[PDB]
A and B are shown apart, each in its own frame.
Chain A
Amino acid sequence: QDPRKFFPDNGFRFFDGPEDSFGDGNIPAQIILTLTRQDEFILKQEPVAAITIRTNEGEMGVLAGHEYTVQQLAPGILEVEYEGGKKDQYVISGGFAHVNDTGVVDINTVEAVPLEEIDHEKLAKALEEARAKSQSPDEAVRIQGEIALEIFEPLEAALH
């Protein structure tokens, strides 16, 4: 019998992740931001001046050389500020954000869509639907109302 014809590669290797160095020098001026939805990215290592995230603990701000920290993202919106003073906002559905000491932010989410692609019109109808589900006493429907409200309330407040 043939001794192990196959030798499959470790699929993790094809990626090129950061090498977290404890730092023997200065900090960059701008964070290298990478943001990813399900499989495809929207931003691949783009220079960015600062970024503001929403969390369960609350809302946080990230600058160059920010402390290495990791925590859950709460389902809401996200704000990104590039070096040119402009801004770009993205609705998300949870995820994890990793900020490197070198200034390389890797964000992984299940969804990412700008605010421009959402209308308050269609958003308004789903609100009272979620409220009726929340008020309808049923463990299978109450939570659905609560969760849809969790993502809609920051949008209703952000568009306004």
Chain B
Amino acid sequence: SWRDAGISYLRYLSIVTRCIHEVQKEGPLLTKNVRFSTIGWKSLYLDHGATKEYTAIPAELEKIPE
């Protein structure tokens, strides 16, 4: 199953939440809940002077951290 695949229980709940937000009806509630599933954030770490993306843990849920 998905357990030994390497993903966390929390990514699992978020996948379920994404699906629920899909199937539900169009309205103000959906307008609220699509926000609670959309991915827009990032991560950054500071080089000697510059910014660089810490891409060791992705935001998308299908992938696996390594």
Contact = CB atoms under 8 A, between A and B. Distances in A.
| Direct contact, A vs B (beta carbon within 8 Å) | yes
Interface of A: 38, 75, 91, 93-95, 110-111, 113, 117-119, 122-123, 126, 139-141, 143-144, 146-148, 150-152, 155
B53 interface: no
Q: What does DSSP make chain A's interface, helix, strand, loop or mixed? A: helix
17 contacts: A75-B13, A93-B16, A94-B13, A95-B13, A111-B16, A111-B20, A111-B21, A113-B24, A118-B24, A119-B25, A122-B25, A126-B19, A126-B23, A143-B7, A147-B12, A147-B15, A148-B15
A78 to B, nearest CB: 13
Contacts, number: 72
Contacts of B30: 117
Given A113-B29, A143-B2, A146-B2, A123 B17 contact: no
B14 interface: yes
A111 B9 CA distance: 15
Q: What does DSSP make chain B's interface, helix, strand, loop or mixed? A: helix
Contacts of A140: 62-63
B20 A113 contact: yes
A16 B22 CA distance: 35
A148 B19 contact: yes
B23 A152 contact: yes
Contacts of B17: 93, 110-111
